[PDB]
Paper text:
Protein gradients play a central role in the spatial organization of cells, but the mechanisms of their formation are incompletely understood. This study analyzes the determinants responsible for establishing bipolar gradients of the ATPase MipZ, a key regulator of division site placement in Caulobacter crescentus. MipZ dynamically interacts with the polar ParB-parS complexes, forming a subcellular gradient with concentration maxima at the tips of the cell and a minimum at the cell center. It inhibits polymerization of the tubulin homolog FtsZ into the so-called Z ring, a structure that forms the basis of the bacterial divison apparatus (Erickson et al., 2010). MipZ belongs to the Mrp/MinD family of P loop ATPases, a heterogeneous group of proteins that act as nucleotide-dependent molecular switches (Leipe et al., 2002).
The two independent structures show excellent agreement with a root-mean-square deviation (rmsd) of 0.44 Å. Superimposition of the structures reveals that MipZ, Soj and MinD share significant similarity in the region constituting the nucleotide-binding site, with an rmsd of 2.4 Å across the 176 α-carbons forming the backbone of the conserved core. However, MipZ differs from its family relatives in the arrangement of several conserved loops. In addition, it displays a number of unique features, including a marked extension of helix 2 and a large loop between helices 9 and 10 (helices 10/11 in Soj). Notably, helices 6 and 7 of MipZ correspond to a single helix in both Soj and MinD (helix 8 in Soj). At the junction of these two helices, MipZ exhibits an unusual structural motif, consisting of a large loop that is stabilized by a short antiparallel β sheet (S6/S7). Together, these distinct characteristics are consistent with a clear evolutionary separation of MipZ from its two relatives. MipZ has no C-terminal amphipathic helix, as used for membrane attachment of MinD, and lacks the conserved DNA-binding domain characteristic of plasmid-encoded ParA proteins (Gerdes et al., 2010). Interaction analyses showed that MipZ monomers bind to ParB irrespective of their nucleotide state. Monomers are unable to interact with the nucleoid and, consequently, display high diffusional mobility, thereby rapidly returning to the polar ParB clusters.
Residue numbers in the entry: 4 to 273
Write the structure that this text describes.
């Protein structure tokens, strides 16, 4: 089983839209995929897959679905419980997922918590969605404005470093991969392209991640969310919103994104 953990420091940058598209790409590639959502307050990924189950049940259409695992009988309430109860629920969900699935996708919220630390410690691949802007890069680390050398890694990056350190000191599993997925922004100014490219490459070198391409924000992802559908699901049998061509560029971005994660051999679409 391979464990993929999606996270970033503040929970933004389309993180849950990327997580649920990674899950459906691996389901259409024929894998069994578990999904564990550690954002106990907002549950964006868990709700997505509850919407998918409800929409498919109502339409009597069959599409692949992941094994969605909750950490307790009420994960919204679990958000306010002691961390030792949150860790217990996570360990039971992870044990089920490990017993049952080929990939385990764990979506994490912004911020630091015991369960987010534990998930990044167990990752084989950490995926960190990041918008292409100077303010966003500070969630990986601050750099000297002249030399672009790291002056302080973020708490997020320190957590990934600690997972890598422990994975080295144990030597029972393979090195963990870490990819930052850079989402292009429609507002990025051309005068900043060279400075943004240089800053993210300076961070990759000193923080130790590799860069892949992310997903541009598009209204279609928001329109599809309440149905639990991804761009990979759209077909002549599944078209829950007015037909448009608004999914073609998104489908190309998703192929490039999955290729950068090492997962092209395992990805499919409807």
């Amino acid at each position: 089983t391979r464990v993929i953990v999606v996270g970033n420091e503040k929970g933004g940058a389309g993180k849950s839209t990327i997580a649920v598209h990674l899950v459906t790409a691996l389901l259409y590639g024929g894998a069994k995929v578990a999904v564990i959502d550690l954002d106990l307050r907002q549950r964006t990924s868990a709700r997505f897959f509850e919407n998918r189950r409800a929409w498919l049940d109502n339409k009597k259409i069959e599409l692949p679905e992941p094994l969605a695992l909750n950490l307790s009988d009420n994960d919204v309430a679990l958000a306010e419980r002691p961390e030792e109860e949150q860790v217990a629920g996570f360990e039971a969900a992870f044990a089920r997922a490990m017993a049952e699935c080929d990939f385990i996708l764990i979506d994490t919220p912004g911020g630091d918590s015991a369960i987010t630390r534990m998930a990044h410690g167990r990752a084989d691949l950490v995926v960190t969605p990041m918008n292409d802007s100077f303010v966003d890069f500070d969630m990986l680390g601050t750099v000297d404005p002249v030399t672009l050398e790291l002056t302080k890694p973020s708490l997020y990056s320190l957590t990934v470093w600690e997972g890598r350190k422990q994975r080295a000191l144990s030597g029972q599993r393979q090195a963990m991969d870490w990819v930052v997925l850079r989402n292009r922004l429609a507002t990025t100014e051309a005068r900043n392209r060279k400075r943004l490219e240089d800053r993210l490459n300076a961070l990759a070198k000193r923080v130790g991640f590799r860069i892949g391409p992310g997903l541009r924000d598009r209204v279609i992802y928001r329109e599809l969310f309440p149905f639990g559908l991804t761009i990979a699901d759209l077909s002549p049998q599944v078209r829950p919103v007015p037909v448009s061509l608004q999914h073609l560029a998104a489908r190309q971005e998703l192929r490039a994104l999955m290729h950068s994660l090492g997962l092209s051999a395992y990805s499919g679409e409807t």
